[PDB]
Design a binder for this molecule. Structure first.
Ligand SMILES: NC(=O)c1ccc[n+]([C@@H]2O[C@H](COP(=O)([O-])OP(=O)(O)OC[C@H]3O[C@@H](n4cnc5c(N)ncnc54)[C@H](O)[C@@H]3O)[C@@H](O)[C@H]2O)c1
Ligand SMILES: NC(=O)c1ccc[n+]([C@@H]2O[C@H](COP(=O)([O-])OP(=O)(O)OC[C@H]3O[C@@H](n4cnc5c(N)ncnc54)[C@H](O)[C@@H]3O)[C@@H](O)[C@H]2O)c1
Ligand SMILES: NC(=O)c1ccc[n+]([C@@H]2O[C@H](COP(=O)([O-])OP(=O)(O)OC[C@H]3O[C@@H](n4cnc5c(N)ncnc54)[C@H](O)[C@@H]3O)[C@@H](O)[C@H]2O)c1
Ligand SMILES: NC(=O)c1ccc[n+]([C@@H]2O[C@H](COP(=O)([O-])OP(=O)(O)OC[C@H]3O[C@@H](n4cnc5c(N)ncnc54)[C@H](O)[C@@H]3O)[C@@H](O)[C@H]2O)c1
Ligand SMILES: Nc1ncnc2[nH]cnc12
Ligand SMILES: Nc1ncnc2[nH]cnc12
Ligand SMILES: [K+]
Ligand SMILES: [K+]
Ligand SMILES: [K+]
Ligand SMILES: [K+]
Lengths: 461, 462, 462, 461
């Protein structure tokens, strides 16, 4: 008589389970952690609040935490990223989950709250797993007392890490965190190669547009912008790249991309005259990858080529000024998460109007909103890091320290390189790759152990 | 004219070298921007720089920027095959002491370094060191320790040199502070990677004129050089396999679209012939070493390689390949300079029509510099703008003149601050005609940076 | 008002389909340009076209262009899984007879074709055929020969269909002339190649959401479909090997940077398990058949494949893969529509956690259409602009009205003239915003062409 | 005491012979024919005038013809394309060759004349091998009596085939020809993949310029244009493509290139006003690939970005208006086959002037002028076709046939597809590739012999 959940349709659980069984075969690092730690039950007595996209891959993460001894209560960190069959399979296994594809904002907040409250009262949670910092913010702001019991937070993504570092700087962070994002087997795997796989996937599913031969503008060239640019270039798009960071812009040039600004002289003074109208007038697709605010702004949207596609693969939808488009332009739904935005006015639209843009996932994370985000074999790296970060903080028991010792222990850290290498080795073996073992003389020659770590902590890969 | 303090192959190549220098200047906007920015201030007035780095046209622009900012220099190459003789001639013709030519012997290489160190039989009054690989740094510390008493710092170009500096620092044997120029992003992630992408397939074509498309390559290593090298071959249509000891680098190779393999069965290098994956090596048309490690293409691998395979090294030192084994056992037939056929049929003589040979490029020395011209000027612009800034910083710090307590606080191996890395990058991007967008105040506040940068935390890996 | 002459999955999908048709029209400038150019002239007035081709959104734009030009049509799909139900619904809601849904049985497939042929239980007075694969053409010749006496021609979309026409021609059994639409350059070297480049990895992602980067693929065939398929996988970072029986196509694969391998030791398929290269197939994560041939992924290959390999086919017919052997011997577990795990453990049931299975996509039917949406509108633009021109040409020639002696001289399989192929291509280039340069009169004289084209001899291969 | 030659330096012969021995191991189709036909001596009695780039690869072709029984007398078909060590090895083998790198135009014509004449009188030639049509034209216009004895012409390249078809159309072709260009193992190997290998090769040797991130304009997108665009794009150039043929332009778009015209709206009206100055002012490299005349004209040259590189990889230098540049601008030699062209005027230049273009090989074929042309393993295909074509036309013995039989055979033809396939098969095996053999049922199913040919003659690959 398990009822402690809310999903779109529980009858999808058998389908969800079939896809979980396939995903386990694609996630050797994660499944290897189940075998390595199951006898030891290192998460026995852990009670984890989880807030991350309720996909099949998150399903395998959740069941790994449970196989290692944890109880969890789960929600998604985006209104469109849940795969309903994954949420169903998790609920049907007796696990509290509150997530469905197509939540309203109010439902999104309610879902987080159902993880935080059990039977109307704060759950006795002692760990947090977060992706974007929304659950972390709600606990700090609305349930600060619960953080007196919590041993740490493991944060998945760049945007969430920034918010943790803000709190650390301000002295408002109450528990230590692991920056899971900055493991190499996360940031340089998930953020880059994951978006390479899933950006053109989402655009094809949403529009079925030919990309070859067409003009794209990618805003940003960090890890997600690098992966996004490659996703489009390998399809034969002519890709241009915008950046505020000259080092990242240098890499885009060397990678064979023309680097341009939406603005004359690169100066964003807020006027229409600042827009390079010739440039925007040729662009068939714009993709925002920055984690910043309003990098595809109202004047850019006004200048864009008719029938251009607009989408965002950064964590939050405020990269694009969708508010301006809601206020001024008429939205025509093509199908779920695909809207034609008619620039002729707000008062209805001509069904045969040519002057529209196509917006994907209402500006929300497009790879998860219009497709299924990253594939299992990539999320294997990210989620093996999450499990190890959860064990790492849970075994250190920060919440049991006195305040003076807590202050010394409070930090936002990355996992040590030896663990990053262990995850990577399991990923490499999953491809059938064979890593070479150094001889003792060679290890001495370059100053490393035969067992690693193989690089100084300064190394950038 | 009057000035004889140099040794080059052919001083009559100077006009040609000057022509190429004027072109390279147009390809190096960050370096020429520093030249214009600092010429009036002469921040290197009174600097006396010992420099040891490949005497190419690009190094010529570096040398003349240091001189233009007030420095005196004495120069040698850090490799026996990497000098461009017309670049060396142009520098000597400018009145600048340089001891470098393409095709030095080992003894001549050592002699050239000593000629920078000594002027008229006695130690020059050097006070700065610019180095690439640590050979000059090592000679100073071992054979001329008294000279380091007046030297304010070393600016070290490459990964191998940095490793050597960090070991000396850990051992307490490093006598002057250093700047790790290699780990500026506009060096490591530009020169080490994209420079090898441009220049590896360049050198292989010049040396052999072999079609690369459709053939099988084995790249040993997948760090910055191995990454760029693998791409140099893959973009030509080679079927590239990658070897690594680092599972993170190996993961990157898989995700980049390469099969990851080991020359040894199960990756276990026990020194036996039986440990060689003979089936794998018997299919390889080209092997490239990129590791900075020792004996990563060993005798048993050389024995097992496909007939007529090409063997080369693009790491700093030639001991990546066991060329000593090949000198001891196999007959060498020079095809042309820096290209030898190595006949595996025996030591004394060869059949001119023997089919069982390998082709070795540059006798195992850095192949991009030995068989072509190394990295192009527009890439070396980034590396050498960092060098100029590093020289300015350490020279103005004046370590040799500080009290002992201050020396102890500053005796370290550091990178340049990220703000300077970004300033070099910005000039490189402008050189391509790229335009960097300026953050609005609100956007800068949103991501927690200054509008002027730095734009990333020091943890960032790019 | 009272239109019932159709059969689709769900007529209420029509508004959705119309929204997507309006979008597709903006992606199909060559086809809509033909609609605008010819609509006033009504060149297809009196044409009664039997159409058998994948009932996609792209085919909807084709259908409505034929109707806009004056034709009546009766339509079916040429594959049981390729229909987009919202496209079929929009076409039916427009009062156009269409018999098509995703997930037909074979019996329903034949029934749908027969519903186009018969109107109110009697042969429709058809006078034109548009076909993709030859099934409609074969049913007409075998079962309704009297209908062909009134048909002016067949316009055939695809390589396999053209092969069937040329067999009939050589055997003396073809009853009406045909245009080979496939071999326009704006079809064959657009649709067959670039279409599969877009849609193969699309369909694999939708069916499995597998990572492709770093995994091993075997593509059987390197014609136009195999070239486009190989690129679809390689651009994702797969390690792609290619099999071929044609040495010229194999040479192209080598030069394009692929290893060319055979499933059979030394390429010799003697029908035994012993001839299978077990080591090679045991490494393969994905096999794709592209040949138009029979049993190129056979039972012994399926037995040898790596556990959990994906198997699919993008040639026209499912007999490229021996699925019948798999139905006879192994247990099928449906993951979701058009995605099956095939458990090699036995026929009677399976362990839900068995590791020894293959994933078959679309039951071996055309995978890009079965698991995704086939080629994108802007590619199908070229193919379907050729179809419209071919229908106009054969309809206006009026073969069916000729005396028997003249029918014999006119009975042929021809391609469209190069000038029309160029005109389709020009509208496609304009759709991308490309600007084609115009020759000066002196340049046109220098290379021996008219300023307006055609620009190449008919021998030219592009 | 053999002296019937003229080369730069006979002392280079040992070096040339070393490179020929290597090249033989890279040319299995050609060396396989050499071994196959040696017993039969199919070219016994053949006396071949040859005019083709005197490279190491041509050396292996020459010695194959001689090994099969021919006598030859040889010249290069370009003033810059000879490898002097190849010419020396051929001469030192006792084979008449007249060729060196850096001929004058007068010397070029002298060298062809030295193959035509032996001892001051027309040689008793009976076969012609040509690349570009210059020898063919001199024979028809200056030595027509010699054509009465000649059985055929085997012509290497697109430009020469066009000239042969123009002669045939006008009734002036005196002997039959085989169009070697249009074997698939020549056109879609040599013309495309050869330029992919050797174009960026020649630009690097001439300028050592970084190509990644810079802007290129390739004029033409036929086989040479396709290969050239790939040569630059695989280095990271941003490549734009110009074409007059809309089908070729369509391929460029689908291949991921922006298609542009040097002229506004594509209309070349001869005035500066028609130039797209904004476009040409951003171009770092222009490469002409057309076989046409004046496709990089004076007005384009005036408008190119300062310091742009200009080069031609079509057969003749008139693709670029070098005559305009000689008349108006000052040329500064950087090194052989590399000139700075100073747009500041005719009479002298400032050595530090910034307003120059870099011209490679004085506008002559740049892959052969500034590097070594195509590599051996590519030329293997072209030159195996040359040998087969020479055997075919020599055995047909056209010069001996009665007039009505000559009339049936006076044509320009390609080799049969079966031979094209057999050449390709040897190339594939050179890579270690394994071709699959059809079963009898599969051969029957697609309507081919198990031995091939596998494609109809209509097939375009
Ligand atoms: N959708 C996904 O699956 C996915 C995966 C990982 C991360 N993310 C999210 O994507 C975002 C980017 O992540 P990242 O790891 O690439 O961060 P990053 O710091 O590596 O890159 C962001 C880049 O944006 C640039 N940028 C900032 N403001 C800009 C502006 N106005 N114009 C142009 N460029 C600008 C920065 O210079 C930086 O290089 C974050 O929100 C992260 O949480 C999404
Ligand atoms: N030729 C050039 O122009 C040039 C340019 C830059 C650097 N370098 C030199 O190249 C070398 C590599 O430099 P880098 O920056 O790439 O260093 P790096 O540390 O980034 O990469 C070296 C890689 O080699 C791998 N490796 C070590 N031993 C191995 C073995 N036995 N088998 C396989 N892989 C092994 C390591 O795991 C590492 O990832 C250094 O000697 C450096 O100074 C040369
Ligand atoms: N799914 C799609 O959207 C789509 C698009 C166009 C065509 N098609 C179909 O795809 C098939 C191929 O079309 P195509 O235009 O590429 O034909 P093609 O003739 O150009 O190529 C088929 C290739 O298969 C090779 N081949 C034949 N038997 C083989 C074997 N046993 N092993 C290996 N290679 C073998 C042939 O040598 C040939 O090169 C046809 O059925 C065609 O109708 C499908
Ligand atoms: N350098 C080499 O090694 C090499 C190799 C093979 C052929 N070639 C020569 O290269 C030339 C091209 O050969 P190909 O086989 O590619 O010929 P091709 O006919 O396949 O291609 C030439 C292309 O130029 C285009 N073109 C013509 N005039 C143009 C103009 N004004 N603007 C833009 N595009 C224009 C044509 O439309 C055509 O597509 C010929 O001279 C040939 O002899 C050189
Ligand atoms: N498939 C996925 N599952 C969970 N988090 C993700 N982030 C990006 N892709 C994801
Ligand atoms: N290397 C080469 N030898 C002869 N002709 C060629 N044409 C192109 N490259 C050539
Ligand atoms: K997924
Ligand atoms: K260089
Ligand atoms: K579609
Ligand atoms: K060559």
């Amino acid at each position: 008589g398990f009822t402690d959940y809310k999903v779109a349709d529980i009858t999808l659980a058998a389908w969800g389970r079939r896809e979980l069984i396939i995903a386990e075969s694609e996630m050797p690092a994660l499944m290897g952690l189940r075998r390595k730690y199951a006898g030891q039950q290192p998460l026995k007595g852990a009670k984890i609040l989880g807030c991350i996209h309720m996909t099949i891959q998150t399903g395998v993460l959740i069941e790994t935490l449970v196989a290692l001894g944890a109880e969890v209560r789960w929600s998604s960190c985006n209104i469109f990223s849940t795969q309903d069959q994954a949420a169903a399979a998790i609920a049907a296994a007796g696990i509290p989950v509150f997530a469905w594809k197509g939540e309203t904002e109010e439902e999104y907040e309610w879902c987080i709250e159902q993880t935080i409250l059990k039977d109307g009262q704060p759950w006795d949670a002692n760990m947090v797993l977060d992706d974007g910092g929304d659950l972390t913010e709600i606990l700090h702001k609305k349930y600060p007392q619960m953080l007196e019991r919590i041993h740490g937070i493991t944060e998945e993504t760049t945007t969430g890490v920034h918010r943790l570092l803000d709190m650390l700087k301000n002295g408002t962070l109450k528990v230590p965190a692991i920056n899971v994002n900055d493991s190499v087997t996360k940031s340089k795997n998930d953020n880059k190669y994951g978006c390479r796989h899933s950006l053109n996937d989402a655009i094809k599913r949403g529009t079925d547009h030919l990309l070859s031969g067409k003009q794209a503008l990618v805003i940003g060239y960090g890890d997600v912008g690098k992966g996004s640019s490659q996703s489009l270039r390998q399809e034969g798009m002519i890709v241009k790249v915008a950046e505020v960071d000259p080092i990242c812009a240098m890499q885009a040039c060397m990678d064979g991309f023309e680097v341009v600004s939406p603005y004359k002289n690169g100066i964003n003074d807020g006027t229409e005259a600042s827009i390079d109208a010739a440039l925007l007038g040729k662009i068939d697709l714009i993709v925002t990858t920055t984690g910043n605010v309003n990098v595809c702004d109202a004047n850019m949207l006004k200048a864009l080529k008719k029938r251009a596609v607009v989408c965002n693969i950064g964590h939050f939808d405020n990269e694009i000024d969708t508010a301006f488009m809601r206020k001024n332009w008429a939205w025509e739904e093509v199908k779920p998460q695909v809207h034609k935005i008619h620039r002729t006015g707000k008062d209805g639209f001509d069904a045969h109007n040519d002057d529209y843009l196509i917006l994907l996932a209402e500006g929300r994370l497009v790879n998860l909103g219009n497709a299924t985000g990253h594939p299992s074999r990539i999320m294997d790296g990210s989620f093996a890091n999450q499990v190890l970060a959860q064990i790492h903080l849970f075994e250190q028991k920060y919440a049991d320290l006195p305040a003076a010792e807590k202050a010394k222990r409070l930090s936002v850290e990355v996992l040590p390189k030896k663990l990053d290498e262990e995850v990577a080795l399991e990923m490499v073996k999953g491809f059938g790759g064979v890593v070479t073992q150094l001889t003792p003389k060679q290890a001495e020659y370059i100053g490393v152990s035969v067992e690693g770590p193989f690089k100084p902590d300064t190394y950038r890969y």
